[PDB]
Amino acid sequence: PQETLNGGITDMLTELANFEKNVSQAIHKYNAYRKAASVIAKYPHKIKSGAEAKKLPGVGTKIAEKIDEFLATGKLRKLEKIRQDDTSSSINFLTRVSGIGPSAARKFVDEGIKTLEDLRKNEDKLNHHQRIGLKYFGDFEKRIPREEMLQMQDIVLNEVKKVDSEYIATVCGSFRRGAESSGDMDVLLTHPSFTSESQPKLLHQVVEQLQKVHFITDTLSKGETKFMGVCQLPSKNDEKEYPHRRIDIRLIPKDQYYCGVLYFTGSDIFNKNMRAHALEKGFTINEYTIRPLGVTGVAGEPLPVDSEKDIFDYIQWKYREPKDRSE
Template identity: 60%
Template sequence: MSKRKNPSDESNPNHEFCEFLSELAEYEKNVNRNIYKYSAYRKAASALSSHPIRITSGKEARALHGVGDKIAKKIDEFLQTGKLQKLENIHNDASSVAINLLTRVSGIGPAKARQLVDDGIATLDDLKKNVDKLNHHQTIGLKHFEDFERKIPRSEIESIEKILREEICKSDAEYKITICGSYRRGKSESGDIDTLITHPSFTSKSSKSDLLEGVVRTLEKCGLITERLSLGNTKFMVS
């Protein structure tokens, strides 16, 4: 699965800062295509997300590793006004809004989103009328847009992990299943479920396609997989 991943949740005391920094990061990645600024915003958001105490000034934020002067000034602006002028400008720019929306569809990157917007496609409804412009992955991403946007509670991931173990190990008890990503880091909810599946015979020199195809078919039969997004020799993406 592919979803947007935010470095913070609402229980974090610095959630508001993380939210606007994440939004600025997405803008830089999707609209400006500036990976340097994208990384800087994400790094700052991650630093604030990990800080257990509410930040009360840009100067205080500046003391955190990953927060520079420009971002500290944005934090001061937000604390003083409750908003950011840069974000206000972004929200008032129709092209930026459309690109940021379309890149939330799994499989649609910044270049594809820009192409779609140039073709007059600005909303999900527009996209549904132009599915012929989408590849398989993007079509599935649009079909399950609401599902992909939804955060997955930890309890639900635990239930899915149990099903994975039971179903996959029915055919071979030597399979080992490990849930990774934000779940492994102890988060209360996740944007997707990253799963590592290993087997003693699955080596760098072995034929991998049969083993992986077998795992996918098993999970399709039990109803855990409803759509294939991609399937390679060593990894697959499904919904």
């Protein structure tokens, strides 16, 4: 796991990944290329041949070939071509705006809209989400230092508690695992009055409060259980102002809360391992529940959970700190 060891190769794979997703609309080729990129990124030798790479889970014949060409010429003909392609490179770029995905990008570029500037000239053609995306294009591609996250957390936990001291809220994501930086803030929310069996107002009042103290500045989307929007730390005195940040707030019912918390803490890799484990011990785990099987594979009713540990207990695993859930 050292940067420019196979950087050339993994930046390559990652470029191709984006073109598959954003231009070709082949999300599964997109994940193939990314998966290759990962397993190569972890590989602790400078790759010498496509054949050496092929040995890795997720590197097949086609990518092996690419690596050979890259290794001998320092570039890829296809990648070089698509990069200079006016239409395609503009479609790929436009998708960097939040709310513009591969379909809307494609339509824009069809009607000659290819640049941020062009988007600015055409706001009347953007939905609410997209306008927010444009407006904060740069801020949203910035990382969030952990210190700022802590500051944001102070504000979130404070105002949630002042709306109702019985609410529970957890900031998960790479934040909860110790990451020195985060992509956004992901808040998980529950209340003792909200169970799977069980007002239709619990998420709304929390969001309202966060707007009233001007933490939440914009709304991408909001319904009865998931909120997605924008936030910002209060500008220190005369100091330079903070970036607007992405924040999601999820209302989960209490008897599914720690499954939710477990799931949205990750990492993805650790989740795959633990869901694998898991089956072998006789259980199925998803973001909501842990259920038992079932001599024929028939899933029983969901078991009670009242903490993260509870889940680990069910499946013969000693509790592992968010600290140590890289895998």
